[PDB]
Amino acid sequence: ENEQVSRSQQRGLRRVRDLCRVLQLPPTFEDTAVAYYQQAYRHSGIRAARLQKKEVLVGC
DNA sequence: TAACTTGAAAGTATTTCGATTTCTTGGCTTTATATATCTTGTGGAAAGCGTGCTAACTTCGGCAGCACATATACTAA
């Protein structure tokens, strides 16, 4: 893995990690967040969505 | 040697006044279902500087270059 990933998904993951580190959440929280983000990205409706949509996806 | 009528002197009280609070209005958010269409929100796959120190031994150990010497072929007498 980490090779069949788009630049948009990579930016989303990096934003997730950045917000996690800003809120100072543990690495377990970081891992759970990235896992849930990947699980949500698996779907196509969220995959091909808006920029604000994917930002709110990071947030949620 | 007191007693009552003086005066400007306090609190003290209540009455209104500035102001901030409380009470009214809308209106949007959200729940589902599908009905339908413009441009512009993206997914994704490409592809056109910069340091320091040696950590020191051994014994290479080669080649760089160089370079010195000379044996030989060319030339003047």
Alpha-carbon gap, residue A29 to A21, rounded angstroms = 10
CA→C1' distance for A39 and B13 (Å) = 75
Calculate ∠ Cα A5-A10-A11, nearest 5°.
150
Cβ of A48 less than 7 A from strand B: yes
- Closest to A33 (Cα-Cα) out of A5, A51, A12: A12
Alpha-carbon gap, residue A16 to A55, rounded angstroms = 9
Cβ contacts of A40 within 8 Å, gap of 6 or more: A46, A57
Q: What are phi and psi of A15, to 5 degrees?
A: -65, -40
Calculate ∠ Cα A51-A24-A1, nearest 5°.
55
- Two tokens, residue A40: 């949500």
Alpha-carbon gap, residue A29 to A9, rounded angstroms = 19
Q: Checking phi first, is residue A6 left (phi over 0); if not, alpha (psi -120 to 50) or beta?
A: beta
**CB A21, CB A27: distance < 8 Å:** no
Cβ of A38 less than 7 A from strand B: no
